[PDB]
Amino acid sequence: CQPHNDFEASRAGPFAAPKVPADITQGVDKEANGSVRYSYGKQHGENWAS
Amino acid sequence: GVGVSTGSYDNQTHYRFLGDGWVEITALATRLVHLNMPKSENYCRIRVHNTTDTSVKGNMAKDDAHEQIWTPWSLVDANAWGVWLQPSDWQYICNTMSQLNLVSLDQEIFNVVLKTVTEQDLGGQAIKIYNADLTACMMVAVDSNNILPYTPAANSMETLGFYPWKPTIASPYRYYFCVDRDLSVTYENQEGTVEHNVMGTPKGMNSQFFTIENTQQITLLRTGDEFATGTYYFDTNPVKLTHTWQTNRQLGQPPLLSTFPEADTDAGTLTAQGSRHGTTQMGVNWVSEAIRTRPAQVGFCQPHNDFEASRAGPFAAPKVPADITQGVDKEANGSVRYSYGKQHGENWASHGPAPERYTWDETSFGSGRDTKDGFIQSAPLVVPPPLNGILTNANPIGTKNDIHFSNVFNSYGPLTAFSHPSPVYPQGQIWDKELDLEHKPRLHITAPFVCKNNAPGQMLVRLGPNLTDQYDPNGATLSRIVTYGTFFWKGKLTMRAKLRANTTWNPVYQVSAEDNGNSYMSVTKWLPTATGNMQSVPLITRPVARNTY
Amino acid sequence: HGPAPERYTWDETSFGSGRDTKDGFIQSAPLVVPPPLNGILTNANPIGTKNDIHFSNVFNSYGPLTAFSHPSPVYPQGQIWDKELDLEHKPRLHITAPFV
Amino acid sequence: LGQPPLLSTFPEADTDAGTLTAQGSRHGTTQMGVNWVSEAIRTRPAQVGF
Amino acid sequence: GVGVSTGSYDNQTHYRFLGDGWVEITALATRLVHLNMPKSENYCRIRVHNTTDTSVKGNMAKDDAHEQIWTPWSLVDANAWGVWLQPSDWQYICNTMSQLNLVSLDQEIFNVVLKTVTEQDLGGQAIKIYNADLTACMMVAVDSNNILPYTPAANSMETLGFYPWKPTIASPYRYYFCVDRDLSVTYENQEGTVEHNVMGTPKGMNSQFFTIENTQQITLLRTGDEFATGTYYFDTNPVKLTHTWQTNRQLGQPPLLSTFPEADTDAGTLTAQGSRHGTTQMGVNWVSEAIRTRPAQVGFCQPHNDFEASRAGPFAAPKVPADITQGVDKEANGSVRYSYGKQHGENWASHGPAPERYTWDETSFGSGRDTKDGFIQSAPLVVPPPLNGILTNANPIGTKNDIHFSNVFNSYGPLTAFSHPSPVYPQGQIWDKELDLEHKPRLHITAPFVCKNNAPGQMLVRLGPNLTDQYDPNGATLSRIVTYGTFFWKGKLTMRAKLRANTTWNPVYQVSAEDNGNSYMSVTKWLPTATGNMQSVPLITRPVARNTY
Amino acid sequence: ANTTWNPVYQVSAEDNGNSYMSVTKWLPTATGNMQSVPLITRPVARNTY
Amino acid sequence: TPKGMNSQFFTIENTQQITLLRTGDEFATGTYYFDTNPVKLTHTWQTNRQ
């Protein structure tokens, strides 16, 4: 079990404490299991038509 | 025969540049020891159980309940950074070298002197006369096998003298014994007196009783004799002499700047948080310097004052020290506070039973925690933080207005990354024996260096019992002649270290000694007084900056 | 004779790593001798709208300083060796069998 | 673990026990900002059990 | 010259596994000795004849009538099991090893110290000052020829100290002399006072007078000198470290079972006693587990308290110890009782002239006797025991209601088979010199080990007489300067031993240390007190079971 | 090795009685029934420092 | 009742190397030698009288 969204703050400022990704199971808990979400561009993989 | 020295005095520090960036630093230290005939003729199993505090409902931490075994042997444990190097030297090392490790260590005992004191009435008074006793002899033993319980001299702050030109007394030897102590929990004024609070009786499964007489080869030496130990080698790993500023916030590639400052006043901007490349562990459609994924976790939230109890009794669960940050959370980050004496570093002018104390703050700015900013949010992470969809350090957790999540949260995970505790020059613990456990800790808070191999081996020492003319054990008549001893000690702690190079443009912070003033780095701090009093204050460890990525 | 098999509870011999829920507690950051009524969390404070669920039942003090021994293997019905898990980061040890 | 507190009092009989030094005025190392130490706040090499 | 040690302290025990089941055990022991200038300037022939008890008609055993020869020499006889090994060690040996024997033994005397004491008035009082005297010297002599009477230190319970960290005094030397003592027999209040009861005069056919001055090469050694003896070897046989349970009842093939138990409650049966194969020494036509012939005789009936008198006087005829059985017959089986002091094992807290005592009971369950069951039957052995055809332990034999056959019966025959007396860890006698007789005894009760070859050789020692300025033998003026001595002792008793193997399914009895409680095997028994007092209680010898057939 | 003065706890088999370390525990019965009960592991004491 | 100091329980299964042999198998032991002394095969008539 990993702390769901444990925002820890430091001298640099508040941040999201990383968490080892894992299966989502039937719980459909994505953000809870650490399922990373990406955001790329056109020169990185997005359709040039969009 | 007798009547001639058996050693040489040398308390310096030589630097041999082995090139390639590495330098071998040999630290020699010699001091005069003062040993008195132990009061305890034999091994005692004294049981100390303070009730002046344990009885009270409010007092819980002041539990000094334990049963030790006082032995008739002293101990010459010079495991202190200030008892080896010189005040000025440490400045050069920390400012130049970027890492250091222990290599070898030797010891020697020369000019052993044993004298007896007798009463002699002078004009009606009674002055003490001191006559040397050649036939007298002392006893030395170096348990390099560590068959006896390891007793760090720094753990009790009773090491040797940090002052070369000043003698020092060897701290008596004593180890803990098996005793089942139990203490109930009571807050302020709970209903009724404390429930349970009693000591324990010796068990047969944990009865650990050792004797210096049967755990080491005692070497008898008189006035003309001298002892010396082999060249022990350390297998400990080198400890970095630099601090880390980079926090979990700054690691990979910074956000692309869309706006460039026209003046030295204003700043630039980033890209559309909603429309910007990056990686976040949230299902949301936006990123920021707070949700962007990082290679690992810098530092971690530690349970604030987590007093765990065991068969031995309640105790404070140790916690890896770290930067205090702007939160000014000292006891929360584990900032260790010390308490030394005059023969350890306190000013000899400050007459009184009150010893000097200071709170050491880590330099690991990266693993710093801040309780005034820590919080959590509901699974469905949304920009607007609901009143119930967030847990700040102000929500009473457990029917308590002072007990929040921070005081009971362990963020230690497979991503936890931190530095080592910066060793202090004065009263600092150098090496330490590893625990005899299948899974020992990743590190020790007491001392940065941890002997992976066997331990150095504490050096025990006791004065030879000078019996009187009359003696009878069965009559409980242990008539002993008043006798003491003063032997010299010579040790060399050879250790190599590497020095960093100027890889930056902006001058890095250094450790300088400002003029005599309110400035902490005042010269008078380490300068003698009109009377001759002196004091040894902590030094800035890890002054140079270190990039953690 | 009977379908009821024999059972026994094995207790470790590691007196050093022993825990006691009847003594575990925490205190506020500003550590003061006199423990305030709200400046301490004993094993008697209902945590989570429950009178039987305290901090002890949900606290993991496992830290970089955690040091413990191995589970004493029993002579009867004791598991000797065991295969390691096919994982990047397998556990530091196994409870089923001392030998891995 | 480490060096036990220095005994200031020695038992005269096998019944009573000895004492320690002034908790407020005694050498040692504690992770608390307080001005006193004890067998409950003294720093240790590591953590035994958890 | 003088002013330097001449030896090393070491009181440990190393185990060298020679494989094949045999292990060489080397026991090193070092202690500090305290010798005082003997009061008797010369050899005395003191005659001790207690009449405070011998005169009485009832008292007969309290006959301490004898004439010894007090010599001005002490003796360093460390013939004790507790003065060699450590309390914990013995546990390991008895639990593992199944037999042990003595091999070699060496001794050494280093750090010889001799000081004199003088009176010095302090404020009207008179405190004693102690000044070392270099010119002073002691005298040592090891009679390896045994020309002098062998005087076991355990026979008088005056060996060396069993406590390493505690000094010890050497027991004075003295041997018996020829004297014809005679004592008549008197019961309670016999008619008239005791008939004869007088000491004797020196005879010319048994006058044995020896002198340490003419029976050994005295080696004079001062403060800077040191002595050492050769490596003496023992020729004694190994003693089993196990007990026997099998009695004369169980030996050969048990009776054939005709019935098999249906439940764990009931038992099986045998065959018709009248019609069953077997061998009995009776002319009867039936057999049983009481009349069946056996390979030999396990144990034997011994005369209970058979006081035999001789030219030297009445004495208690020794008797081989054995199991007490259910008869609880201690004094009847020969269970030896001891009486040691504080420097020998008694608690230092038990202040008083009353020494600790304990009755040792053998572990030879096989040779155990029971007076509450012993009996005899007429020649014509018949099932029905006639009132006159049997002699139970209740028939007044010799006009006495308390004197039966058991008190005066010696069943020692060519079939007598028994074990050896289990040696006790504390105050136990190790080796012993054999009697100079054509037919010496098959064994000794005092010590399990009996030197078949020559004896080790007691070590004598006396302080050198420090004469005064004035002296005159003819004027009976023996002015001696008050002087004492304190020399160290170092000995190594090397001995090999074999260990048994687990050849059974059911765990054999072992020697464990139960928690602090009423349990005899309590840890506190061997643990120091708040003051430092300690005691050494006997240990379970021969814990493992041994099959005798 | 014996590096202590006070005898360390051992595993012995007390006589037939209420004692857990009873011999009958590992001894056959009149019928032949037997049982195997757990044993005291790690009887010797170990110093962790 | 069974004592713990004299409890002697042995098992043929753990006290010797059992040799399994079927119908076509056969066993044989080594040549054991005796060290016993010879016994006279004659009687004595002479008594303490002659």
PDB file of C-alpha atoms in Angstrom, chain B residues 171-266:
ATOM      1  CA  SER B 171      36.164   6.477  31.535  1.00  0.00           C
ATOM      2  CA  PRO B 172      35.077   3.393  33.544  1.00  0.00           C
ATOM      3  CA  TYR B 173      33.712   0.374  31.676  1.00  0.00           C
ATOM      4  CA  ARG B 174      30.131  -0.861  32.013  1.00  0.00           C
ATOM      5  CA  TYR B 175      27.594  -2.751  29.900  1.00  0.00           C
ATOM      6  CA  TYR B 176      23.819  -3.222  30.015  1.00  0.00           C
ATOM      7  CA  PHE B 177      22.228  -6.405  31.362  1.00  0.00           C
ATOM      8  CA  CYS B 178      18.985  -8.308  30.750  1.00  0.00           C
ATOM      9  CA  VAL B 179      16.095  -6.768  32.690  1.00  0.00           C
ATOM     10  CA  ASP B 180      12.383  -6.650  31.874  1.00  0.00           C
ATOM     11  CA  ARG B 181      11.238  -3.078  32.511  1.00  0.00           C
ATOM     12  CA  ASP B 182       7.636  -1.983  31.961  1.00  0.00           C
ATOM     13  CA  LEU B 183       6.044   1.475  32.009  1.00  0.00           C
ATOM     14  CA  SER B 184       2.422   2.448  31.371  1.00  0.00           C
ATOM     15  CA  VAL B 185       1.375   5.524  29.395  1.00  0.00           C
ATOM     16  CA  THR B 186       0.078   8.577  31.256  1.00  0.00           C
ATOM     17  CA  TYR B 187      -0.742  12.048  29.929  1.00  0.00           C
ATOM     18  CA  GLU B 188      -0.454  15.129  32.150  1.00  0.00           C
ATOM     19  CA  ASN B 189      -2.884  14.120  34.902  1.00  0.00           C
ATOM     20  CA  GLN B 190      -4.603  10.883  33.883  1.00  0.00           C
ATOM     21  CA  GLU B 191      -7.241   9.271  36.102  1.00  0.00           C
ATOM     22  CA  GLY B 192      -5.249   7.589  38.857  1.00  0.00           C
ATOM     23  CA  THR B 193      -1.541   6.945  39.365  1.00  0.00           C
ATOM     24  CA  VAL B 194       0.609   5.227  36.739  1.00  0.00           C
ATOM     25  CA  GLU B 195      -0.528   1.636  36.194  1.00  0.00           C
ATOM     26  CA  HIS B 196       2.648  -0.432  35.826  1.00  0.00           C
ATOM     27  CA  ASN B 197       6.193   0.724  36.578  1.00  0.00           C
ATOM     28  CA  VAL B 198       8.548  -1.941  37.936  1.00  0.00           C
ATOM     29  CA  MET B 199      12.029  -3.310  37.251  1.00  0.00           C
ATOM     30  CA  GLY B 200      12.792  -6.889  36.237  1.00  0.00           C
ATOM     31  CA  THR B 201      14.671  -9.956  37.455  1.00  0.00           C
ATOM     32  CA  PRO B 202      17.609 -11.698  35.696  1.00  0.00           C
ATOM     33  CA  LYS B 203      16.474 -14.083  32.954  1.00  0.00           C
ATOM     34  CA  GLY B 204      18.194 -17.316  31.976  1.00  0.00           C
ATOM     35  CA  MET B 205      17.779 -16.866  28.229  1.00  0.00           C
ATOM     36  CA  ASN B 206      19.381 -13.418  28.105  1.00  0.00           C
ATOM     37  CA  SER B 207      21.755 -13.466  31.081  1.00  0.00           C
ATOM     38  CA  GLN B 208      24.896 -11.890  29.617  1.00  0.00           C
ATOM     39  CA  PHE B 209      27.710 -11.762  32.176  1.00  0.00           C
ATOM     40  CA  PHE B 210      31.288 -11.298  30.983  1.00  0.00           C
ATOM     41  CA  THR B 211      34.634 -10.870  32.737  1.00  0.00           C
ATOM     42  CA  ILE B 212      37.700  -8.996  31.493  1.00  0.00           C
ATOM     43  CA  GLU B 213      39.674 -11.708  33.283  1.00  0.00           C
ATOM     44  CA  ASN B 214      38.319 -14.402  30.956  1.00  0.00           C
ATOM     45  CA  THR B 215      37.795 -12.451  27.728  1.00  0.00           C
ATOM     46  CA  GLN B 216      41.279 -11.155  26.921  1.00  0.00           C
ATOM     47  CA  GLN B 217      44.994 -11.722  27.514  1.00  0.00           C
ATOM     48  CA  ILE B 218      45.863  -9.188  30.212  1.00  0.00           C
ATOM     49  CA  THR B 219      49.388  -7.833  29.729  1.00  0.00           C
ATOM     50  CA  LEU B 220      51.082  -6.862  32.992  1.00  0.00           C
ATOM     51  CA  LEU B 221      53.481  -3.928  32.640  1.00  0.00           C
ATOM     52  CA  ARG B 222      55.400  -1.957  35.268  1.00  0.00           C
ATOM     53  CA  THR B 223      57.278   1.350  35.140  1.00  0.00           C
ATOM     54  CA  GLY B 224      59.972   0.153  32.751  1.00  0.00           C
ATOM     55  CA  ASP B 225      57.563  -1.731  30.495  1.00  0.00           C
ATOM     56  CA  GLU B 226      55.512  -0.520  27.530  1.00  0.00           C
ATOM     57  CA  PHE B 227      52.694  -1.855  25.347  1.00  0.00           C
ATOM     58  CA  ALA B 228      51.726  -1.461  21.687  1.00  0.00           C
ATOM     59  CA  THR B 229      48.941  -2.805  19.468  1.00  0.00           C
ATOM     60  CA  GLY B 230      49.060  -4.015  15.877  1.00  0.00           C
ATOM     61  CA  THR B 231      48.122  -1.917  12.856  1.00  0.00           C
ATOM     62  CA  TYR B 232      44.345  -2.327  12.673  1.00  0.00           C
ATOM     63  CA  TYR B 233      42.779  -1.619   9.278  1.00  0.00           C
ATOM     64  CA  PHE B 234      39.307  -0.208   8.633  1.00  0.00           C
ATOM     65  CA  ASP B 235      36.968  -1.523   5.938  1.00  0.00           C
ATOM     66  CA  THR B 236      34.463   1.324   6.254  1.00  0.00           C
ATOM     67  CA  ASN B 237      33.375   3.293   3.185  1.00  0.00           C
ATOM     68  CA  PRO B 238      34.333   6.946   2.509  1.00  0.00           C
ATOM     69  CA  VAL B 239      31.909   9.687   3.549  1.00  0.00           C
ATOM     70  CA  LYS B 240      31.250  12.662   1.269  1.00  0.00           C
ATOM     71  CA  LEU B 241      32.344  16.031   2.657  1.00  0.00           C
ATOM     72  CA  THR B 242      29.751  18.068   0.764  1.00  0.00           C
ATOM     73  CA  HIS B 243      26.093  19.053   1.108  1.00  0.00           C
ATOM     74  CA  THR B 244      23.186  18.720  -1.323  1.00  0.00           C
ATOM     75  CA  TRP B 245      20.942  21.642  -2.265  1.00  0.00           C
ATOM     76  CA  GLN B 246      18.917  20.035  -5.055  1.00  0.00           C
ATOM     77  CA  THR B 247      15.474  19.003  -3.836  1.00  0.00           C
ATOM     78  CA  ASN B 248      12.820  16.787  -5.431  1.00  0.00           C
ATOM     79  CA  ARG B 249      11.674  20.006  -7.118  1.00  0.00           C
ATOM     80  CA  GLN B 250      14.782  20.459  -9.275  1.00  0.00           C
ATOM     81  CA  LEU B 251      16.170  17.432 -11.117  1.00  0.00           C
ATOM     82  CA  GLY B 252      15.584  16.842 -14.818  1.00  0.00           C
ATOM     83  CA  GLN B 253      15.048  19.353 -17.618  1.00  0.00           C
ATOM     84  CA  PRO B 254      13.454  22.617 -16.382  1.00  0.00           C
ATOM     85  CA  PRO B 255      10.264  23.915 -18.074  1.00  0.00           C
ATOM     86  CA  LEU B 256      10.827  25.661 -21.411  1.00  0.00           C
ATOM     87  CA  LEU B 257      10.880  29.449 -21.044  1.00  0.00           C
ATOM     88  CA  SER B 258       8.346  31.213 -23.270  1.00  0.00           C
ATOM     89  CA  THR B 259       9.133  34.710 -21.995  1.00  0.00           C
ATOM     90  CA  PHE B 260      12.527  36.354 -21.480  1.00  0.00           C
ATOM     91  CA  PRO B 261      13.087  39.021 -18.774  1.00  0.00           C
ATOM     92  CA  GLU B 262      13.546  42.489 -20.270  1.00  0.00           C
ATOM     93  CA  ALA B 263      14.846  43.848 -16.967  1.00  0.00           C
ATOM     94  CA  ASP B 264      16.817  42.392 -14.057  1.00  0.00           C
ATOM     95  CA  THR B 265      13.623  42.879 -12.048  1.00  0.00           C
ATOM     96  CA  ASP B 266      10.877  40.876 -13.766  1.00  0.00           C
TER      97      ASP B 266
END
